[PDB]
């Protein structure tokens, strides 16, 4: 999953 | 239910140092990422950088690398912001935001920088 | 950074007709994950802003079906197959695949009554 923007997996 | 509610207005001699506050609430503070962005007057958004209440760990663009420095008080729910050696090109909105299943952004406190 | 550029800057369009906004991006925002993250956002004249669309499609809560959101790798465009009053604003793209997230130039959308 996205590590850059973690906060945009939900 | 997610909120946040920034800081009035302030206003900053060049050079100066100014301190942002961003109440939340609706949702656990303490483990969600906190983002800040800013918003010039004719220019776009810029993102700034990211803080995790939980270990206080913390992001930035290259940009405001040692300009701006973000903390979270967990006791209260406060995630700040300190921009420091402020220019009068610093002016601007800025906003702190959540981003999960429910984004949301401050109302946007109102930086100006002047003599 | 990933560079974003949205096209037209401005639009006019009377009530009820169709409009379509585009996003073009230096990179694909397609990451390792097979997701590729990109949102649009609208900011109303005296408010904050608010996502509309992420994962280039999804439509947030409470978003009327008259906002749809499309795409490839490096080209995006957000349709509003029906263009209300209320629907004035400045729409942004923003990425989130690359770092740092990074915003579009914004475009200004008017009601032609």
């Known amino acids: 999953a996205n590590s850059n923007n973690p906060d945009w997996d939900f | 239910q997610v909120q946040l509610v920034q800081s009035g207005a302030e206003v900053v001699k060049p050079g100066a140092s100014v301190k942002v506050s961003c109440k939340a609430s609706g949702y656990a503070f303490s483990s969600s990422w906190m983002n800040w962005v800013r918003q010039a007057p004719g220019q776009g958004l810029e993102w700034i950088g990211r803080?995790?209440?939980?270990?206080?760990?913390?992001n930035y663009a290259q940009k405001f690398q040692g300009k701006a420095t973000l903390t979270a008080d967990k006791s209260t729910s406060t995630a700040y912001m300190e921009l420091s050696s402020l220019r009068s090109e610093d002016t601007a909105v800025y906003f702190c935001?959540?981003?999960?299943?429910?984004?949301?952004w401050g109302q946007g406190t109102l930086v100006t920088v002047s003599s | 950074d990933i560079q974003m550029t949205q096209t037209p800057l401005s639009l006019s369009v009377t009530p009820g007709q169709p409009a379509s906004i585009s996003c073009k991006s230096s990179?694909?925002?397609?990451?390792?994950?097979?997701?590729?993250?990109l949102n649009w956002l609208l900011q109303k004249p005296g408010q904050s802003p608010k996502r509309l669309i992420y994962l280039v499609s999804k439509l947030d809560s409470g978003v009327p079906d008259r906002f749809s959101g499309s795409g490839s790798g490096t080209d995006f465009t957000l349709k509003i197959s029906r263009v209300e009053a209320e629907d004035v604003g400045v729409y942004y793209c923003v990425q989130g695949t690359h770092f740092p997230q990074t915003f579009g130039g914004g475009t200004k959308v008017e009601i032609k009554r």
């Open positions: 935001a959540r981003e999960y299943d429910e984004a949301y």
């Open positions: 803080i995790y209440p939980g270990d206080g760990d913390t």
């Open positions: 990179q694909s925002l397609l990451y390792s994950n097979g997701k590729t993250y």
